[PDB]
Amino acid sequence: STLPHVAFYISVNRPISDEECTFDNSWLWKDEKGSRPFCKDANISLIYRVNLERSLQYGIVGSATPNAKIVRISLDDDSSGAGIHLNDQLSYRRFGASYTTLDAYFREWSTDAIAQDYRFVFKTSNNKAEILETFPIDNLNVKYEKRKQSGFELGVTGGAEVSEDGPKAKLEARASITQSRWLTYNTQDYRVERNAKNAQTVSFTWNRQEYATAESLLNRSTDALWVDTYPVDVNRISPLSYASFVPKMDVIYKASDTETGSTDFIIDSSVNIRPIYNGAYKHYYVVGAHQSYHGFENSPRRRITKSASFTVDWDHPVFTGGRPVNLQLASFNNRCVQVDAQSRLTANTCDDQQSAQSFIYDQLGRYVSASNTELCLDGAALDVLQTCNQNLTQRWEWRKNTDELTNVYSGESLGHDKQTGELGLYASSNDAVSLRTITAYTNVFNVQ
Amino acid sequence: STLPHVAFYISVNRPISDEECTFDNSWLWKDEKGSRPFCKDANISLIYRVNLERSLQYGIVGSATPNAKIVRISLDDDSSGAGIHLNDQLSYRRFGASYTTLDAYFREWSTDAIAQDYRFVFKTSNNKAEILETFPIDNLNVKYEKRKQSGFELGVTGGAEVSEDGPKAKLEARASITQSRWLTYNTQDYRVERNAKNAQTVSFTWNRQEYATAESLLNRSTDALWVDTYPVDVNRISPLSYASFVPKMDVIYKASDTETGSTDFIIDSSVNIRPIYNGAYKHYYVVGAHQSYHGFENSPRRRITKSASFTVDWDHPVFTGGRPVNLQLASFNNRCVQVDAQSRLTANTCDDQQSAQSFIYDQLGRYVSASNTELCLDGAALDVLQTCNQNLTQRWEWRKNTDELTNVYSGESLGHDKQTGELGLYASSNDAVSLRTITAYTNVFNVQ
Amino acid sequence: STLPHVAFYISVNRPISDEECTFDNSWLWKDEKGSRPFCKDANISLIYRVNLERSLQYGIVGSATPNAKIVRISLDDDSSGAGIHLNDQLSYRRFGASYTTLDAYFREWSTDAIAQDYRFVFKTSNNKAEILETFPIDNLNVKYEKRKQSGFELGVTGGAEVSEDGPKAKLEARASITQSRWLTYNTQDYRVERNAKNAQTVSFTWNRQEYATAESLLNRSTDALWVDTYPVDVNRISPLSYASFVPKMDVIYKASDTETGSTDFIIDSSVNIRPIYNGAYKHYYVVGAHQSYHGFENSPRRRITKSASFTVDWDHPVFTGGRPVNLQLASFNNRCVQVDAQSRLTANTCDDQQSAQSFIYDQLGRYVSASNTELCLDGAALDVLQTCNQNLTQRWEWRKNTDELTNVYSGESLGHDKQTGELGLYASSNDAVSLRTITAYTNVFNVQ
Amino acid sequence: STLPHVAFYISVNRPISDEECTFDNSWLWKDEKGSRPFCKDANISLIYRVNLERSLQYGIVGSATPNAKIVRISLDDDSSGAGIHLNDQLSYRRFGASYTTLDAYFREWSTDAIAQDYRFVFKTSNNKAEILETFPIDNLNVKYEKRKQSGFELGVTGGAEVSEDGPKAKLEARASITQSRWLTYNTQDYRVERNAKNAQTVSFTWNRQEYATAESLLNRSTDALWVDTYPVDVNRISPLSYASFVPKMDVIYKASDTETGSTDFIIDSSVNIRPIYNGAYKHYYVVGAHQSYHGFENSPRRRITKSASFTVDWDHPVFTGGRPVNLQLASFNNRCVQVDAQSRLTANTCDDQQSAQSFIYDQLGRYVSASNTELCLDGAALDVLQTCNQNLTQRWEWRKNTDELTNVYSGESLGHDKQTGELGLYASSNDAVSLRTITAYTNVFNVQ
Ligand SMILES: [Ca+2]
Ligand SMILES: [Ca+2]
Ligand SMILES: [Ca+2]
Ligand SMILES: [Ca+2]
Ligand SMILES: [K+]
Ligand SMILES: [K+]
Ligand SMILES: [K+]
Ligand SMILES: [K+]
């Protein structure tokens, strides 16, 4: 009775090799210090849930929901997978300049790679489907709190200084005017950015926001020359950026209710791997020589992607919105009514997953072919399916408490020849004709 | 009618011996001051709840949930156990340097061990199962509150100083410009870090965050030489660190609906035991000699683990999603239809937990073997189970208000020989054949 | 139909005698000033609610809840009792040193005792039961709010001083740099600390947190010598400390579904009674002599405990999960089927609370003994209970609208001899045999 | 079907006479200035709701609620009364010292009395009942917000002074270190303090908290001598202090399910009436003479109490938990079965409120005397009530669609002699015996 679905999981598993995230050990002296792997068993492991369905059940008229074929791709709390992993913990290596100098970089630290962003792109092979809705629904409309302060202050002062010179009196008056502005807003360390290039493609990117630059990771900005310590505050790097990331997003595609052909849906899951480079700069000043710490933002990044795809055939029986049944000729042990390519009807061995043996019993009482809902079983000519119309010969009702299917127009029962299974209309059975018809729901809702 | 489960508890009990958390009494003089136990009846006591189930009931088609075999491992409010325990209360010992000096560490305190972190690792013996979802769902996306302030201040001052010298007048003007930035965020003393190396393994770690270092536990940083007191603020160490810790987490594994074989699931519960070492450093300055307190972070830690495991056989009857019944031949006191290894049918003494005597009565009316859902009881050949298909001889219905099982194809009843229990189809009973069949639900949902 | 319970209250009443909380009048001069009672009709009055039950109803298979025997001990809003009481109000006594001095304590106040902590310990006599869950669920994971501020300030100043000496002009420039850190967190005056030593014992302690020391109760730290007043701010001592304390906690124990024997559960409710001692110290300085107030933390404390216990017999009928009935032989005025020690059946005068006359009517239709669910009433041999199996002679059904119990295998009715009550199977009653059986629910759910 | 209650209101009305709150006009000169009434038609008007009930309905076994007899005393939103009233508005009188002086109190104001506290004490005459639960559930566990701030500030200053003497340059450097602690918590002007001396008595006191002292009511602390004004800020005295106070509290007592005898419950409602005295102290100083305002805390207080009480008979029929019926012999116009003191049965004129004519029709079908649930109507001997047991002669069922009560054991109907109403068992009625029995619910749930 309820709306049928085609539901399946898509596993996206992609181990990231050691060479796939090997970067130069240093950014200032990239040609001298060699290279090393900045990850440790990096991996992508996601599980998408895909649903195919019609927007409404078969034959429902006057609904407030438009008729459409819906493809829903979801990565939610019920089905997410392990996630994207880069590192168990972050380490660093320190490198010094092989030659001494005066005003240049003399030290460098390279920290294990973090995820600059995670990107998930949903594409479509053709334009038969359009994005109907997504989750997250939209980019954030940031809320700001503004605050204006105005103040004044009035003061007086009376002093009395007594010394050998003589009494000395002071009188002072002060007036001050103050004005300040405040701005308050919220950030996160990863901000979701939704980017919809056109009706067929949308991408969700979780981008580093609060500490996005290597410079922002420094807990100290200046130091004395004798200080030689790691200047990065690793506590500012959340485990969300290397240990495990799981996105939450939904994409709903829709096609027109009369769409034909097929469409490939592609999901691109990627992580922008970014090693962190920091350098110490020697500033020689006559007053005092100090070192200043800097982060390099032009350092290399590598995007590691895994693509998953599935094909949707818009003529799949799930997009009729109905639950099909078969018509089994019960004089035989295993024979069902089957429709071939040119609409003719034959009796073949029943197959529960064969859509050519599936019919939808609609509201009018017609048996419409599940593979082509424009064709009906017509009692006037029971050798080929006929175009659905309002013919009374196309309407059937089940005789109560029996296995007889009767035609509405004439009241005759659907019978089949006991030798060949050829269908016909008969007032009553005889030696050569059986009136026993058995119907059961078929399972045509497997992804094929 | 509802979906069956296999549910059981796994107790993880591990007393931690005195030697398992014996550390050096001192960190600076580890070879001189001996060792002592830093715990007091440390213990791990957890109770995991495991559920085995199918994602859907047997034979349901067109659902929005994909077909899958689900393994759920839970440590929640309904079933958690005592928890992980290290100490009733924290004590300390003070040690002094055996030799006096000038600029070195001269005092040390070693505090009873706390839990640096609690780690729970969920592994899998092979890749037949993948992590589908977890709780906690993901690592935290930290929210920051930024605040920008800009201000200006204008002032004037008018002074009048009178003395023996003569009247003196002052006029002053001030202008100030201010700019400040605020950053606000929340921490905890234990932060959950989710780490999913691949599709088969996930680890949850509760890591000390707010006071993670021995240095952060010092309530004072400097003191005069004559001061000799414990410099650690024990109020900063919550009872969550040593008295009792109970995690809350769920892991859901999934296997394909056609998975075979078996899989071992391993749960590793561990605590990273960390003694706390602090030292007082003597700083001799000509202006003034003082002592500065330091915490040592390179001090030893010991991880104490307890592993629990259970085996899941993917061919368990619970993963069919149906509730099996037996077919008892009621002419005998105790005889049931039983399937042997090669599919033949015999009559044996009924066993309520024998899956070889269990059948699922499906929607079509077939009796499919619970141990192999591809085999049916077929009325055409009642000596071996046959492959499930759409044969009408494989469909059975119960005659109303009787103990007769009738075949759909021919209408004959299932009968058994009164001496050997051999099955057959009969229009009516006779002296040698009984038509009495009794069915009851079997209990095949025990973990075996 | 629903799950039966054994429910009862445990009253824990313990008046605390005057000598049980008599402490020394002074801490500095404990041998000179005598002793006094620091309480006023101190009392412990708690009411625990205990529930015994099975986790599931009898015979339920395939549930997501594991089979277990549950013991629930609760002290909640529905049943708590009066609480723990120490004082109606807090008073103090002042004591002075009998000898004058220069730099020593010269005054002391001893305040009426408060509760340093309230402790509730749940123990178990053996390891047949394990803690499954508690309330409070765990120790608190404290949440901290961190705040970083950075600022700069730029200023200019222009002064013009005019006097007899001549015009004088001033020009000044200021630059400031500021940095501050904030840490915010919540405390209570009593913090719950959960301490689970092992799988059998858990203790909950409400420990003073915000004002835990006598020093923290002083509203003033220094004073002039002539000042002679009580230096304790009694408003900082909440009525929760002495007037009435009621804990809220739950402990759920579980045993194996096949546990035998018995187990003693012990509840230890205690209060750590602590008198408050403060002293005034005379500090003689040439610049100025003052007095500083101090609190003494090494002052004595006394723990006053009351132990309650109850015994759980794991073979109690409540742990079957079923609601038993008796089988009354209705030809007699008062005769029921009774099982003796070795399984034989006799007719004895009915007792509604006798578990030897109680049977569970299970899903199969068997009458299993409530005192031993492995024994059934078997129609093949109606003189001794038989091991439960799938025998059809062990299944019974009630003939509709009558008082006849019929055997499933043969259809014969259960009858009893009209003189001795010996059971048997009969097609019909006669002069010596009655077929009238009456069944009613028995009350075996009293704590015994 | 549902659980019966005995419900009634207790009105506590106590007008407070003028002399009952007449205090001295002054505190410093109490013997000179006379006395006056500090209230204006002070009054106590409260309405308590009392419920008597059993914890469970009659005959319910296996419940998670223990069997108990419950007495509930409530003062809630549904039933509270007018409240406690002291004054329409607060006025004051000013008094001056009859003799002038130098350093002493020279003025005094006496303000109309406020309520220092409202106290409600629930007592019990004996220990048959214990406090099971209350509302408010417990004393408040105050929550504190702590805040630590640490900061540093660095500054430089460059000055250039130009005058006739010559150019003068200044260079300054500043460094500051700051540290602050914050503590935040909530108070009310009336705090509820629960005080449970033992299992039988609990008191609730609403005590003034925020402005509890006469000193805290002063809006000014010092003034010049010529100032002569009322120094009390009457806006700090809420109308809750004098105009109307209504408490909200519940007390639930429980007794053993087999308790006998009676118990008196006492409710003491009182208000601690407190006049407010303030004085002005003349401080003569050579620099300047001023007056300082003081409040006196040792001023008199008077507690005005009204006691209400009610008696609970633990053998009241409401504590059976069942709804009784009577057995009316319907051959008479007005005759019911009645039980006398020694258990004999007679026919007397029916009284709907007579518990001696009330029976509970229990689950077994027994007619249990409502005044003594250990006695049943037994068909073997219908002249005296018999001890309840499992006799089949003690079970009755109503013949359908008739007024006949039939015995379960023999099937005979309960009949009564048409002249005397003597009960008996008869197969059929005759001229001297009527089989017509009429039953109706009786109203035994009035407080008696
Ligand atoms: Ca509408
Ligand atoms: Ca849907
Ligand atoms: Ca489930
Ligand atoms: Ca329960
Ligand atoms: K602000
Ligand atoms: K701020
Ligand atoms: K702040
Ligand atoms: K603040």
> What is the DSSP track for C70-103?
EEEEEEBTTB--SEEE--SS--EEEEE-SS--SS
Chain-chain contact of B390 with A350 (C-beta, under 8 angstroms): yes
SS3 of residue D48 by DSSP? strand
B131, B141, B150 ranked by CB distance to A181: nearest: B150
Q: DSSP per residue over C191-234, as a string? A: EEEEEEEETTEEEEEEEE-TT-STGGGBS-SEEETT--S--B-G
Question: From the CB of residue D220, how many other CB atoms can be counted at a distance below 10 Å?
Answer: 12
**Resolution, Å (one decimal):** 2.1
Does residue B355 contact residue B369 with C-beta atoms inside 8 Å?
no
SS3 of residue C39 by DSSP? coil
Amino acid present at C201: T
Six-digit token pair at C212? Answer: 């835990």
Q: Which residues of B touch C148 (CB under 8 A)?
A: 182-184
Question: From the CB of residue A230, how many other CB atoms can be counted at a distance below 10 Å?
Answer: 12
The dihedral over CA atoms of C366, C370, C375, C378, expressed in degrees to the nearest 10, equals -40
Phi, psi (deg, nearest 5) at residue D212: -95, -20
Ligand nearest to the CA of C49: 4
Largest CA distance in chain B: 146
Does residue C283 contact residue C103 with C-beta atoms inside 8 Å?
yes
Whether the link from the prior residue into D136 is cis, omega within 30° of 0, is: yes
Nearest to B120 by CA among B6, B43, B196: B196
- Could you tell me whether strands A413-417 and A433-434 are parallel, antiparallel, or unpaired per DSSP bridges? antiparallel
Chain-chain contact of C197 with B43 (C-beta, under 8 angstroms): yes
Return the residue of D nearest to C439 by Cα.
Answer: D364
Does residue A101 contact residue A291 with C-beta atoms inside 8 Å?
no
Tell me whether A41 touches chain B (CB under 8 Å).
Answer: yes
Nearest to C252 by CA among A53, B81, A76, A364: B81
C176, C333, C351 ranked by CB distance to D392: nearest: C333
Tell me whether A173 touches chain B (CB under 8 Å).
Answer: yes
Q: Rounded to an integer, what distance in angstroms lies between the CA atom of residue A263 and that of residue A278? A: 47
- What b/e sequence results for B397-406 when a residue is b if at least 16 CB atoms lie within 10 Å of its CB, and e otherwise? eeeeeebbbb
Q: Which residues of C touch D141 (CB under 8 A)?
A: 188-190, 238, 240
Q: Rounded to an integer, what distance in angstroms lies between the CA atom of residue C337 and that of residue C424? A: 12
Q: How was this structure determined?
A: cryo-EM
Q: Rounded to an integer, what distance in angstroms lies between the CA atom of residue A339 and that of residue C311? A: 74
Q: How far, in Å, is the centroid of ligand 7 from the Cα of C163? A: 46
Please state the separation of Cα D385 from the chain's center in Å. Answer: 42
Chain-chain contact of C352 with D390 (C-beta, under 8 angstroms): yes
Does residue D62 contact residue C322 with C-beta atoms inside 8 Å?
no
C-alpha distances (whole Å) from C338 to each of B181, C422, D26, D307, D339 are 84, 11, 86, 58, 35
- What b/e sequence results for C39-61 when a residue is b if at least 16 CB atoms lie within 10 Å of its CB, and e otherwise? bbebbbbbbbbbbbbbbbbbbeb
Nearest to B444 by CA among B330, B325, B361, B362: B325
SS3 track for chain A: CCCCCEEEEEEEEEECCCHHHEEECCCCCCCCCCEEECCCCCEEEEEEEEEEEECCCCCCCCCCCCCEEEEEEEEECCECCCEEECCCCCCEEEEECCCCCCCCEEEEEEEEEEEEEEEEEEEECCCCEEEEEEECCCCCCCCCEEEEEEEEEEEEEEEEECCCCCCEEEEEEEEEEEEEEEEEEEEECEEEEEEEEECCEEEEEEEECCCCCCHHHECCCEEECCCCCCCECHHHCCHHHCCCECCCEEEEEEEECCCCCEEEEEEEEEEEEEEEEEEEEEECCCCCCEEEEEECCCCCCEEEEEEEEEEEECCCHHHHCCCCEEEEECCCCCCEEEECCCCEEEEECCCCCCHHHCEEECCCCCEEECCCCCEECCCCCCCECEECCCCHHHCEEECCCCCCEEECCCCCEEEEECCCCCEEEECCCCCCEECCEEEEECCCCCCC
SS3 of residue D66 by DSSP? coil
Q: Rounded to an integer, what distance in angstroms lies between the CA atom of residue A336 and that of residue A340? A: 12
SS3 track for D339-354: ECCCCEEEEECCCCCC
Tell me whether B31 touches chain C (CB under 8 Å).
Answer: no
Q: DSSP per residue over C333-398, as a string? A: SS-EEEE-TTSBEEEE---TT-GGG-EEE-TTS-EEESS-TTEE--TT-TTB-EE--S-GGG-EEE
Looking at B140-277, list the stretches that DSSP marks H as alpha helix, in order from N- to C-terminal side.
none
Nearest to B316 by CA among B150, B128, B444, B226: B444
Does residue D301 contact residue D217 with C-beta atoms inside 8 Å?
no
Per-window interface: B 94-123 vs C, CB < 8 A: none
B137, B144, B197 ranked by CB distance to A210: nearest: B144
Please state the separation of Cα D407 from the chain's center in Å. Answer: 49
Q: Rounded to an integer, what distance in angstroms lies between the CA atom of residue A402 and that of residue A423? A: 18
DSSP β-bridge partners for residue B129: B255
DSSP C235: G
Tell me whether B145 touches chain A (CB under 8 Å).
Answer: yes
Tell me whether C17 touches chain D (CB under 8 Å).
Answer: no
Per-window interface: B 401-420 vs A, CB < 8 A: 408-409
Amino acid present at B260: T
Nearest to A14 by CA among A90, A116, A82: A82
Spell out which residues have Cβ within 5 A of ligand 6, the ion: B 182
Interface probe, candidates C170, C193, C250, chain D, greatest D C-beta count within 10 A: C170
Nearest to C192 by CA among B240, B274, B179: B240
Return all residues near A75 (Cβ < 8 A) that are at least 6 apart.
A46, A47, A48, A49, A120, A246, A247, A248, A249, A250
Residue indicated by tokens 């839970």: B74
Chain-chain contact of B144 with A187 (C-beta, under 8 angstroms): yes
**Radius of gyration of chain A, Cα coordinates, nearest whole angstrom:** 37
C-alpha distances (whole Å) from B263 to each of A81, B354, D39 are 18, 22, 83
Six-digit token pair at D290? Answer: 């001023």
The counts of H helices and E strands in chain B are 0, 31
Please state the separation of Cα D32 from the chain's center in Å. Answer: 42
Q: How far, in Å, is the centroid of ligand 2 from the Cα of C82? A: 55
Q: Which residues of B touch C159 (CB under 8 A)?
A: 170-173
Touch D-B: 3+ C-beta pairs under 8 A: no
The tally of CA atoms less than 13 A away on the side-chain side of residue C70 is 27
SS3 track for A129-179: EEEEEEECCCCCCCCCEEEEEEEEEEEEEEEEECCCCCCEEEEEEEEEEEE
DSSP β-bridge partners for residue A272: A117, A303
Chain-chain contact of D149 with C181 (C-beta, under 8 angstroms): yes
Q: How far is D353 from chain C (nearest CA, A)?
A: 31
* Backbone angle region of A320, left / alpha / beta, with phi > 0 → left and psi within -120 to 50 → alpha: alpha
Tell me whether C431 touches chain D (CB under 8 Å).
Answer: no
Tell me whether C331 touches chain D (CB under 8 Å).
Answer: no
